[PDB]
Design a protein around this ligand. Structure first.
Ligand SMILES: O=C1C=C(NC(=O)c2c(Cl)cccc2Cl)CC=N1
Length: 272
């Protein structure tokens, strides 16, 4: 679908992820005064071409583009990062969010893509609190006959959601996305509390200032087996699952395909 900027009118700002800004716009090509609300991402053909080939209930829906800006579905409940501090959410619902992330991620990996920006702020919720994986700004196609994508520097990347191989070897495997999921799972269990966030907690792990974490210091701590702590009221078994996703060796981490039945089982145990 080719959208026309003439009938696209901006309503209000949502934010920015990979330096590209997202805003709520109204598309009214018939001038009925109500129109339909869409999300417009601006300032790149690969991110658009990746999202174009993706169709899944747990992946933000591509709607089209306009002369270039990305047009996606607008989701009213927003990101998990802002949603969790706002509401009283139970353990089962948090595990259901994690299960839905895994389903969306398993599908992404099936289409031969890696996300590389899997964090709670990049996961959105529709009206039925259903997961919608967003911000494909860092997403890449894993080359055919290759097990990883060679990263061109950690530059503007969420390093505190990254496995040691991404920082040390500049390698991004499907298993590197599992490590980020482990960190996202840690985020859900802290109810996305800012005082417990991964950049904040990792600095606290040694006792260094807001910007004293080097790629070497971070690599050595992760290789030494130092990990994020168990979030308050988090069941030991949900924490042990995060640790499995945080295995030093990439090949030893669970896959998303195998994490789904496990998160389904754990969700049932804590329900009601
Ligand atoms: O309602 C929405 C919101 C979207 N994007 C984000 O909210 C978003 C921002 Cl503004 C910054 C960083 C990451 C993300 Cl996912 C996409 C589609 N519909």
């Amino acid at each position: 679908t080719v959208f026309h900027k003439r009938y696209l009118k901006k309503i209000r700002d949502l934010g920015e992820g990979h330096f590209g800004k997202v805003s709520l716009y109204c598309y009214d090509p018939t001038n009925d005064g109500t129109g339909e609300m869409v999300a417009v991402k601006a300032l790149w053909k690969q991110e658009i071409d990746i999202l174009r080939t993706l169709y899944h209930e747990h992946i933000i829906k591509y709607k089209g583009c306009c002369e270039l800006q990305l047009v996606m579905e607008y989701v009213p409940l927003g990101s998990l990062r802002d949603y969790l501090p706002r509401h009283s959410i139970g353990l089962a619902q948090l595990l259901l969010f994690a299960q839905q992330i895994c389903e969306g991620m398993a599908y992404l990996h099936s289409q031969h893509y890696i996300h590389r920006n899997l964090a709670a702020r990049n996961v959105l919720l529709d009206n039925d609190r259903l997961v919608k994986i967003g911000d494909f700004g860092l997403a890449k196609a894993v080359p055919e006959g290759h097990e990883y994508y060679r990263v061109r520097e950690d530059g503007d990347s969420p390093v505190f959601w990254y496995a040691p191989e991404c920082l040390k070897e500049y390698k991004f495997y499907y298993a590197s996305d599992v490590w980020s999921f482990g960190v996202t799972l840690y985020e859900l269990l802290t109810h996305c509390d800012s005082s417990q966030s991964p950049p904040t907690k990792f600095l606290e792990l040694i006792g260094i200032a807001q910007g004293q974490m080097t790629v070497l210091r971070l690599t050595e701590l992760l290789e030494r087996g130092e990990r994020l702590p168990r979030p308050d009221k988090c069941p030991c078994e949900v924490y042990h699952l995060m640790k499995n996703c945080w295995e030093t060796e990439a090949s030893f981490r669970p896959t998303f395909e195998n994490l789904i039945p496990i998160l389904k089982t754990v969700h049932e145990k804590y329900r009601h």
